[PDB]
Ligand binder design. Structure first.
Ligand SMILES: OC[C@H]1O[C@@H](O[C@@H]2[C@@H](O)[C@H](O[C@@H]3[C@@H](O)[C@H](O[C@@H]4[C@@H](O)[C@H](O[C@@H]5[C@@H](O)[C@H](O[C@@H]6[C@@H](O)[C@H](O)O[C@H](CO)[C@H]6O)O[C@H](CO)[C@H]5O)O[C@H](CO)[C@H]4O)O[C@H](CO)[C@H]3O)O[C@H](CO)[C@H]2O)[C@H](O)[C@@H](O)[C@@H]1O
Ligand SMILES: OC[C@H]1O[C@@H](O[C@@H]2[C@@H](O)[C@H](O[C@@H]3[C@@H](O)[C@H](O[C@@H]4[C@@H](O)[C@H](O[C@@H]5[C@@H](O)[C@H](O)O[C@H](CO)[C@H]5O)O[C@H](CO)[C@H]4O)O[C@H](CO)[C@H]3O)O[C@H](CO)[C@H]2O)[C@H](O)[C@@H](O)[C@@H]1O
Length: 752
């Protein structure tokens, strides 16, 4: 009646009576709630609702907030759809020295408004359909309707009218520089180039005035790369092919490591003979990895400048990208030159640690910490301590994964609840608007999956579906479901076209959606790979490999700008902390200092963190910039994270800094994260830095034909690491010709 059994656990189906623990703080109490009752979607959109999208404000606001279907920005209003393009004169880079922040952003203006001839008083805008990256927004006023189809990577906006015709309204009269009757090429007063397309015979009127009109029930708008009539002619070819379906289909080739993704649209013809295809605008993370077979479709000189650099290309029905999955590990192995008794001391010191809150995030950080300690305890021969840590993980998870208490009533805290209205699993206690805004389910639940994966590595029985594995699989479905999931939308967190996760469930900001900790996203994907490998779930594993590998490609472009092509030259920092649809910030969601505005995109450190070391020149450049700003190696906070990061390129330096300060303070103290960040430990730090000192640099030039591995290179000497989750021994072949044998449930080397 009020909960559903899943193996030995359960989730609530009615909102629980929350146990506030006597806490009266209104912020805390307000967090223990639900997402909005009203969803602005039509009756054509049923089942679990998509969240965490670039377009989500359309579903949550009566109209919308400002959105970034690059190359455009748009927003829905009662009067119609405002369209804007950030030109170079709209873009700024600002620094607040006192705050230690930087901001790259544009403007919230209007180049023109797409209007309906019958009304400028629409009652609302709803989601009428969506696919993997386009949305169809429907402005409604009784008989009057205007359906707008648009998307990230679409230089078209398609507009379909019921009970009226087209109007384009400008504050200052545009320059119509090409008048083909039914097709016009035009520029705003400030020289931004667009085009509009109607069916043949439906001619544009009002040329030279502030208002352009057309009798058609269909128009398209395009952003033109240049004031160029040859480009206009090309845009005409696909202006009548309205995108209805759009899918990002992927494969993982386990033998080579190649993750192949094909982006395919299906269109509906608005004039006789319109082709089945479109003009895509590709982002850097896409076109830098374009498959050979798609190269012939590139429209070479078709460039658009946006927050994320230069978009380009590309015509037709589909295109394909190719990426390389680099492996992950369950932990670093025992290969460091540490004082083993010193490490054992740190492992025991860690029993003093405790969670600094009762919510899913703080509890998550704590269980992540225990899961990281357990394999290190095993390696040092502290086997009962390792079992103690895994026992504590079991006690915590077996609590959280049951929604009912001993009497069969719903609990008031430490439980999961299925919100049916949206279709999402919410955990209470909640924080960071995980429940009220559907935020951060990857960030939080990734830690629960880490804990489960460490249990499963030692105890396959616990992890069975009929035991505790069903509830873990339910949490994973919430944040990364496959298609046709009866409870959850497809790949909730991930935007397959933008290439990254979006953290905010609702997206009701004028900068679109955002993501701060890309490393906490990569942590979630890693842990699902590990969990799925441990539990024999190939389909789930491969989906997490696709996510890990794609997200990595976006991180290296938009957070790190490893290729030094995207961030403006005048932007001082060597990282963007928070990526939005519409802007980039060197800033945090909480009040922080200098280190945190870098390290929130490094933490936590774990067996999937080696992606951070693929670009040693970047690692050096970012570290040196942070050091310059600090003015020394007296890190303001989270010193251990900076040492661990530094170890990717200079472990001698990291070791020197660590030796100097790691023992400055003693046991766990929540009031002091100067030296050890609260999700980290001395044991983890010491183990990490000494391992990288012995191993050398991450070597992404070598792949393997199994997924759980890493390759390091120290002055030309390679070390090959594999962990085998199987009951049977395996042979792993590496792309440089090397091969190794691995026994069941072990590393090939450094089991300790
Ligand atoms: O060391 C002591 C110090 O530690 C800090 O903990 C760090 C922790 O905060 C950090 O968490 C990451 C987190 O940022 C991220 O979650 C965010 C989520 O926080 C964000 O919420 C925003 C609200 O912040 C915002 O607040 C509004 C406010 O800005 C405005 O001025 O006033 C309004 C008054 O009501 C207020 O509402 O509101 C918007 C909605 O409008 C919310 O969305 O939302 C984003 C998504 O949009 C979400 O991603 O993700 C993770 C947690 O889920 C974390 O990565 O993590 C660090 C490392 O673990 C911690 O060190 C404490 O916060 C400090 O208090 C301590 O002193
Ligand atoms: O200095 C001591 C105190 O500092 C603290 O932390 C600071 C921290 O709160 C701050 O967070 C930044 C966010 O405020 C910022 O949020 C922006 C939104 O406010 C804005 O909302 C608009 C809304 O105002 C308008 O009415 O409606 C719009 C929709 O129509 C809506 O968009 O949206 C922006 C995006 O569109 C959004 O950016 O977001 C920043 C990241 O981009 C955050 O960094 O950041 C400071 C720097 O890190 C922190 O110092 C503590 O919270 C206090 O307790 C301390 O006392």
């Amino acid at each position: 009646m009020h909960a559903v059994s899943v193996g030995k656990g359960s989730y609530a189906t009615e909102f629980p009576e929350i146990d506030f623990g006597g806490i009266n703080d209104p912020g805390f109490r307000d967090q223990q709630g639900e997402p909005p009752a009203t969803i602005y979607r039509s009756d054509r959109v049923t089942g679990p609702m998509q969240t965490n999208s670039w377009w989500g404000s359309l579903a949550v606001d009566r109209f919308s907030m400002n959105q970034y279907p690059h190359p455009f920005s748009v927003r829905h209003r009662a009067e119609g759809l405002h369209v804007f393009y950030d030109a170079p004169h709209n873009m700024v880079v600002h620094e607040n020295r006192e705050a230690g922040t930087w901001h790259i952003h544009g403007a919230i203006g209007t180049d023109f408004t797409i209007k309906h001839s019958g009304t400028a008083n629409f009652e609302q805008a709803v989601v009428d359909d969506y696919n993997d990256w386009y949305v169809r927004g429907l402005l409604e006023n009784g008989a009057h309707q205007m359906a707008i189809t648009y998307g990230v990577g679409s230089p078209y906006i398609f507009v379909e009218y019921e009970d009226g015709s087209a109007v384009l309204d400008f504050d200052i009269a545009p320059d119509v520089w090409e008048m083909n009757g039914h097709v016009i090429g035009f520029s705003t007063h400030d020289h931004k180039h667009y085009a509009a397309f109607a069916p043949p015979g439906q001619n544009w009127s009002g040329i030279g005035s502030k208002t352009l009109t057309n009798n058609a029930d269909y128009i398209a708008i395009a952003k033109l790369p240049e004031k160029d009539g040859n480009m206009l002619a090309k845009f005409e070819q696909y202006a009548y092919s309205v995108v209805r379906d759009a899918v990002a289909d992927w494969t993982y080739d386990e033998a080579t490591g190649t993750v192949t993704t094909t982006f395919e649209v299906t269109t509906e013809a608005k004039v006789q003979g319109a082709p089945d295809g479109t003009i895509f605008a590709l982002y850097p993370h896409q076109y830098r990895h374009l498959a050979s077979s798609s190269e012939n479709q590139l429209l070479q000189n078709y460039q658009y400048e946006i927050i994320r650099g230069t978009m380009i290309g590309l015509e037709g029905k589909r295109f394909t990208t190719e990426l390389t999955y680099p492996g992950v590990l369950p932990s670093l192995p025992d290969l460091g030159d540490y004082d083993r008794e010193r490490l054992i001391g740190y492992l025991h010191d860690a029993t003093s640690d405790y969670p600094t809150g009762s919510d899913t995030y703080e509890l998550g950080k704590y269980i992540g910490k225990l899961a990281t300690l357990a394999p290190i305890a095993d390696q040092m021969g502290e086997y009962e301590l390792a079992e103690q840590f895994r026992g504590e993980l079991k006690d915590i998870l077996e609590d959280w994964l049951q929604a009912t208490n001993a009497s069969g009533q719903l609990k008031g805290k430490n439980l999961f609840y299925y919100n049916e209205n949206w279709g999402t699993i919410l955990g209470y206690h909640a924080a960071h608007s995980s429940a009220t805004r559907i935020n951060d389910h990857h960030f939080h639940y990734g830690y629960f999956v880490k804990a489960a994966a460490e249990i499963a590595r030692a105890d396959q029985e616990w992890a069975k579906s009929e035991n505790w594995g069903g509830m873990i699989d339910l949490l994973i479905r919430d944040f990364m479901a496959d298609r046709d999931d009866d409870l959850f939308p497809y790949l909730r967190m991930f935007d397959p076209y933008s290439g990254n996760s979006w953290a905010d469930g609702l997206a009701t900001f004028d900068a679109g959606n955002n993501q701060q900790s890309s490393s906490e996203a990569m942590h979630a994907w890693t842990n699902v790979i590990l969990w799925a490998e441990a539990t024999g779930n190939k389909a789930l594993r491969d989906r997490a490999i696709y996510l890990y590998t794609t997200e990595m490609s976006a991180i290296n472009e938009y957070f790190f700008d490893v290729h030094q092509e995207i961030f403006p030259e005048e932007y001082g920092p060597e990282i963007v902390t928070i990526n939005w649809g519409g802007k980039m910030d060197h800033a945090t969601w909480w009040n922080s200092g200098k280190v945190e505005k870098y390290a929130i995109n490094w933490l936590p450190f774990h067996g999937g963190s080696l992606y951070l070391g693929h670009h040693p020149d970047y690692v050096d450049r970012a570290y040196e910039e942070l050091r310059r700003d600090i003015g020394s190696t007296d890190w303001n906070l989270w010193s251990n994270l900076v040492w661990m990061y530094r170890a990717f390129t200079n472990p001698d330096d990291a070791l020197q800094q660590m030796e100097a300060s790691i023992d400055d303070y003693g046991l766990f103290d929540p009031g002091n994260e100067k030296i050890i960040e609260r999700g980290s430990t001395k044991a983890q730090t010491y183990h990490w830095i000494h391992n990288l000192a012995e191993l050398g640099r991450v070597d992404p030039t070598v792949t393997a034909n199994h997924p759980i591995y890493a390759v390091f290179n120290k002055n030309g000497n390679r070390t090959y690491i594999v962990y085998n989750f199987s009951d049977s021994p395996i042979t792993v072949q590496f792309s440089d010709g090397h091969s190794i044998q691995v026994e069941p449930h072990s590393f090939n080397i450094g089991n300790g």
